[PDB]
């Protein structure tokens, strides 16, 4: 069903989900440590576990489409077909021709490493896999696969992580940029949180740092809070936390980080105060190899106006950024901090 | 089966072979070529039944495609090329309409108005040639009555249908009323 | 198989009506050609399925009573019959029958003969308790091999129970 | 029906077939092309009865459209082209007026003064060709008394309107007074 | 809409003729508005439903005829100032009255999965208190203020 | 004790022999909710009802039927049966407050002997 | 009469499909070879395992040659067991491999045995097993380790 | 393990032979029909019974009254039992299976047509014998049968 | 011995096959035995997959069975070059235990005995459709005693008394 649907480009989501369940019942993979998360006993230190062992399984209530099954296909499916089906989710999540083309090339290279023939299945035009992300069960399956192969990194079928890696920390750009800020400065995470200002970044931090969320556990359900359906609106997204995302991205950009030049500028948020706070933090880090109230008093000695030296530092940190893409933090800084 | 292993109780909606009627409007195109003209319609059934040697087409329509192939073989009128010595005899047939087929194959998944062609060479020994099919089997949620599908075969051909339909792979049984019901296809086909 | 008369003999009484109409290029020579022309009356049966065997037996009575019109342009045949009878059949339970008329027409090409047909079937059930004449008494056959042969090709099935009443076993079209 | 499942009690407005009279004016145009002239009016009814094989038109006027087709077939006068050998025989018929049809089809939706054309080829075997239609069936709230609809057929043709009127799918009956009441269309149609 | 429809059936020959539109009257009918707003509510509660594509077209019913709250949220989210203290900054004594008439407690205007956003499509309120014509002063003031802070949204409100 | 009974059995097709009937009816108490003390009495009353099953004259699906009258709380029972070929539902009437037999086997298969349900 | 509601999820995998009910009991009775869950509800866990084995419906993969037959059974209800520490609505999984010779594989359980103070009438627990299976009730009960008016009463393990 | 089994079966038959020229001797007919199962699609359990049915059909081959190309014909419907040393065999069902394989034995070439309905019958009444339907050991031998009681099958041997 | 398959647990393995055949000789082969002798030495040095060795042997046997001669095989035209080609699906009853999975990989074989030329495509099949018996692909026209004919290819057969031969084992460690 799924093979001929992909070949004809008219596959049904129910059929691909059912086949993905059927071909991913690899109970193999032996745990070594307890994998409890959110008060759920997934496994106990030495029991074999499958991909779908960590998600409850029910029976879908609906009509099954016909299907275009080909009976001349051998049992060479699990080697490369589930990997392709999971990769066509990340490929379809791009919505831009160049990135989609690059991801398709990478997926074809990954698949050809296994079977070595791999005639491409989906037709070049009329991409139908964009809709797959809309469905909930497909996202649940892909996130379960990603987490299972993230715990078992050295598995034989660990190549399935391609395409499903996009599910990890999905719509969690605020936490990602918080970690990027904590790493690119070397400053402690307990100390950086005091430096945030503008009283909107403070509220976004408060809503991000609820104690009972265990956001500092890698082998947990947190990174897939929206693919598993745990939360329909992720509090760690870049749209629900635009002020902190903008401030952190700008601060990292002013500290000469290659990452903070492609994140897009959040829409309809006050920028002047956020830019001032980001410039203050960036100058403090780049000129003082860090206390927050000391720098606040130093700035108040200027009655809250950036000094020309700080503008020169920002100019140095933003000059010579070739190929800045539009609507991103790099473009905004080059337009405003490079007068 | 249940006599062999443990725990294979059947379903509750359809017990084993719950008989059901599925109305559907169909369409058909036929094209059969051969080295020599078919002396009998029986050889026509032999030559056409090898159309699904390698099946790529639809699944919820496979028994329906078999019955439509049967009706196409029944109405295979000849062509002027089938005369004494012109070329390879190319047969042709086209049938279109609506019908309901009684079958005991269980609930069939909903079908859609899609047409797929079929091409496959055959070799029944003496005769050779290729095939060319075009099906348009799909449901019909209307209420108007439709002619019974087995009636579409004229009584002039198929002196005994119980095996002419079996040549294509179907398994037929008699409802003792005058309407044939489809039991199943060729074993696990 | 059922304990309570799964596929046993049944007696169904009904009041019916008939009006035959047959046309052809040239007049029929033998009764067999008439049978071949009439037997293709239900190539596309649209009417009620439950009345198909009764429709076939009324076609039998119509074909057996085909008298040519005094006009015999193209030779057109005609027949009609209305009566009351009960049919012994072995087809199991039958759905209830209503007083509705349904037309029929299917052109025939049996080779030598070509034309169309026209039927008039108003075969309906009723619950009157009075005794009614046998359905097969409407025939004028040779009991040896006449009603058993023409009816068989009309797709009907007949047999003997040693009582003397013709019984209906099966309906066998295009077979 | 009620013998099958639970709770299908009829409404109190019309019990089962509460007879009602629907006064309505109408208009009609017809054009029947054929390869050979129609020898008998029965062949005309056969050729026109399939005018709605694929029906797109009105539902509240579908029985009315059928009766208008019947009246047009009744008055299908020939043309000079129908003579010995000029061209294909082309027929024509048009009727206009007002009438009331007693029927037991339940309350009809309010009809509007809108015209719909109909075109469909027919294949009754020997005879080929197509049709043409233009109905203008709509309500008439005026108290003006109208002739009975079944009266519009001349007694010259239709020796048995019980079947000539049934050829188009209608089911007729007699009101024990000489007025024909329309029972319903062909079942499930 | 055509692109959205072709994503599902992939034939989708257009139905309504290009000229002589008839679907403008559909908004007048109360039952059509009730159905479309109920659909929008249901698919807003269930974002990840398999038929969530129906949100197109029915999204217009969400917060319909409620531009005053739209511009109030835009103002509170363009300045970074808290909604608790922005209201201290409104002036002229008719903007204050409009704020009073918008901020009745028992209206559930801060609840997303509530009946408030469809107060005029369900027929809950024939005259929406939260509109831009009943609250023109606040709309004008807040909209201009958002414009003065270089916001792209604040350039097209009449 | 005096009691009252109203049998009601339904199946897709009418039963072949008494063995099919008893196999179908023996699954009436898969989830027994009534009084536990009356369970043997309930079994014997169900047995006497199964002995006197006479189908309705209309014998839609075949509807088996029977009646017999010979704390004072009436409790109903209904459990579907799936013995393979024969499948349907049940309906009892027990108010525990006659054979024509053969009996030692059919009654035992009801669970009678002590009582041995689902043996 | 210890009234209690329950829930159950089961999954049995074997190299070859099971011969009969006795082989199923042999492949399942080793589920508590190393017991880690709540010790108080052990007899109730055994009876729930018995009902799960009695209701082990097969899957399409159990056919001739598709994959390893993966049996499945789920049961949810409410009953009383004639035969305990106050149990609570807590779920625990069990994973243990079985080695009964001709058959190999593992298991999977989800027990939810807990109290029920509601006075609503409860069906008898031993009635949950259909009469179709378990020709000898006592033998199958003994296979799981269980020891057994017409209502069976649990003696001990 | 390998003893005689008096097995009851009711079947159906109609033989259909077409060739270029009429068959002279019965041995040529046997050579033409012995290749009827060059590609066996039907159930293997009914193969010996199918060859028995082929024997009964070939023994009663009568040409049609028309005899264009010579077309032979037969038809047999009956009830009987076959004694065989074939061991246990799966029970049969009431299914019909057709066959066709063209033959080229030199002078004679053509096609075939079968309709076999070998089905079990559990009636306790005594029914006739399969070998009484004949009018033989060598005919079985060149059909691959070994011999009346059947011993074993020897195709292409 | 183990408990899954003790010694000779009989199993059926459905599999598709394809075959190309080409045999050359100084003189045309008269009888079938000469053809089998000239073909049986194809695996003198074996390089291909070991799990398909019995199936390769049976396909070589069936190709030997259907060696239809070419027009060059006539009285005196050129070196007689034979040819055969058999395709389809079949299942082989054998008692060789569980066989490793097979993939769709063509495998040529070019060994002298004249020379030979093979192309096997023995691969697995997971379809449920019924396939003809593999020993039944050999027509009764040749192989008067097919036990010896199929045994001198390295195989050892045994009649099941039903008419379907079962493969016991190959030649010792072949």
Author numbering:
A (entry chain C): 54 to 342, 373 to 422
B (entry chain O), D (entry chain N): 41 to 229
C (entry chain T): 51 to 122, 127 to 229
E (entry chain B): 160 to 317
F (entry chain R): 64 to 122, 127 to 137, 152 to 178, 192 to 195, 200 to 211, 224 to 229
G (entry chain L): 61 to 143, 148 to 212, 217 to 225
H (entry chain U): 56 to 122, 127 to 194, 201 to 212, 220 to 229
I (entry chain P): 50 to 162, 169 to 229
Source paper text:
A double layer of M contributes to packaging of the helical nucleocapsid: the inner M (IM) joins neighboring turns of the N helix, while the outer M (OM) contacts G and the membrane envelope. N-RNA, N-N, and N-M-M interactions govern the formation of the capsid.
We were able to fit an atomic model of 19 protein subunits, comprising 7 N and 12 M, and two long segments of single stranded RNA (33 and 35 nucleotides in length, respectively) into our density map obtained by sub-particle reconstruction. The atomic model contains 19 subunits arranged across three radial layers from inner to outer: N layer, inner M (IM) layer, and outer M (OM) layer in one intact and two partial helical turns of the asymmetric units along the helical axis. Based on the extent of interactions between subunits, we defined an asymmetric unit to contain an N subunit and two M subunits. Compared to those in the crystal structure (blue), in in situ N (red), the N-arm rotates downwards (towards the base) by 30 degrees, and the C-loop rotates outwards (towards the outside of the capsid) by 13 degrees. The IM layer bridges between the N layer and the OM layer; there is no direct contact between N and OM. Despite its location between two successive turns of N subunits, the IM subunit interacts significantly only with two N subunits in the same turn, not the N in any other turns (rows in orange). The main vertical interactions are between the N-terminal segment (Leu41 – Met48) of IMU and the main body of IML, and those interactions determine the distance between successive turns.
